[PDB]
Design an enzyme around this catalytic site. Structure first.
Site, short mmCIF file in Angstrom:
data_model
loop_
_atom_site.label_atom_id
_atom_site.label_comp_id
_atom_site.label_asym_id
_atom_site.label_seq_id
_atom_site.Cartn_x
_atom_site.Cartn_y
_atom_site.Cartn_z
N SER A 289 0.89 -1.18 0.00
CA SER A 289 0.00 0.00 0.00
C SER A 289 0.91 1.20 0.00
O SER A 289 2.03 1.09 0.53
CB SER A 289 -0.80 0.05 1.34
OG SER A 289 -1.45 1.31 1.55
N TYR B 160 -1.18 -0.31 10.32
CA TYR B 160 -1.41 -0.81 8.99
C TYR B 160 -0.18 -0.44 8.08
O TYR B 160 0.34 -1.30 7.37
CB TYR B 160 -2.68 -0.12 8.40
CG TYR B 160 -2.89 -0.44 6.93
CD1 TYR B 160 -3.40 -1.67 6.53
CD2 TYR B 160 -2.59 0.51 5.96
CE1 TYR B 160 -3.62 -1.97 5.14
CE2 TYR B 160 -2.80 0.24 4.63
CZ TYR B 160 -3.34 -0.96 4.22
OH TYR B 160 -3.55 -1.16 2.88
#
Lengths: 231, 228
Positions: free
Chosen positions: A144, A158
């Site tokens: 990501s 995350y």
């Protein structure tokens, strides 16, 4: 029989579903993994088979090590071989500061995003490695832009989990390159401060993932491709 | 007088950071995860030199140990200005296809969750959001985060890249609250420079990043690798 096989984790929706559909369109047989919702998966399987493709729904939560072994077993039984893995399943969480995060939140974030992807890659290496009578294969991990940007005040946990995927990609790629396995990743940005002025479509992430899975990336391994509209 | 807690301060880089921090005028909490004797010796050498230190038990891989490690600091010294997240583990060299889930889970719990939970405790004390007066955190990463540790411990490498991005994101998160967060990436510690680094040279970089001479440095990661 001589048709290559991809397992896509979290294949039921969003990027994972767009990967499954595109892979079938390019001639792969597709393992469509879902963790909770069999109907959603069967719908992706249906779009593929309706279109003349081959796919099967495979149950399993990547946060569960027992499920991982089972999902790979189901691949062995249904298809007889494994040529690609797309480590797409994973989770985000609701926005919190680090100083508010519980241990249970962080432990799960790491178990699902990192351990789940490492264990799936391990199962794939055991089957595709030329060291074990495999014929080689390709793995694409989904990271990501958070791995680069940090996700301050939302989910630094995350972001860390996806940075772990970047280096897991680099180190595994150097570990298994000589044995005929390529290992790369993509860093999706905002997918339905972006220079291109819009969110990306899941199909656009899938296009990149299938590129890195394909024989037109035969000298690409250990690379990480941003799919972020310039972000 | 500033106070720094050093996790895994018993030996190696962590013990070097404790010794140098005391030499530079810090009061020091020397954390140890299991047998206390090496930490007690670090403390005594600091004490006999005229520094102030205490040995503080607690394994960062046990979430239940972390609160009491920071309470001990609070009671002993009454403030916290620095944290060095040095506690960490490696494992025996294995390929990824050989690793157990136990090995992977533990590498992440100790090296990542451990550092995250200790940084949270420090943030809770230092942040001007909660009437703290600011502070600095240094995380210990590794050149493995860049190089990947193929065939040895890709898992460890992934854990320290996690630290790298934790460092970046938390820095950005707490920058307005008077807290700085940086990391070092040690290479081969006792190579273009043709020699391993000494623990003390890594300590030198960590102390620099904890100091007011790094007052505009936050979210940076400094390699201490002899060119590696």
């Amino acid at each position: 029989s001589d048709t290559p096989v991809v397992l896509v984790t979290g294949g039921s929706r969003g990027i994972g579903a767009a990967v499954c559909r595109l892979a079938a369109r390019q001639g792969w047989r597709v393992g469509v993994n879902y963790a909770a919702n069999r109907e959603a998966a069967d719908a992706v399987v249906a779009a593929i088979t309706e279109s003349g493709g081959e796919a099967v729904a495979i149950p399993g939560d990547v946060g569960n090590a027992a499920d991982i072994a089972a999902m790979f077993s189901a691949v062995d039984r249904q298809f007889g071989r494994l040529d690609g893995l797309v480590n797409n399943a994973g989770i985000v969480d609701y926005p919190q500061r680090v100083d508010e995060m519980s241990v249970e939140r962080i432990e799960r974030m790491l178990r699902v995003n990192v351990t789940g992807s490492i264990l799936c890659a391990a199962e794939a290496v055991r089957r595709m490695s030329r060291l074990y009578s495999g014929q080689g294969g390709a793995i694409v991990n989904v990271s990501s832009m958070a791995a680069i940007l940090g996700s301050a005040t939302q989910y630094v946990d995350y972001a860390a989990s996806k940075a772990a995927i970047d280096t897991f990609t680099i180190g595994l790629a150097r570990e298994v390159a000589a044995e005929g396995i390529r290992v790369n990743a993509v860093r999706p940005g905002i997918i339905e401060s972006v220079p291109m002025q819009r969110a990306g479509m899941p199909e656009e992430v899938a296009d990149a993932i299938l590129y890195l899975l394909s024989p037109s990336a035969s000298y690409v391994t250990g690379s990480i491709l941003n799919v972020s509209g310039g972000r």
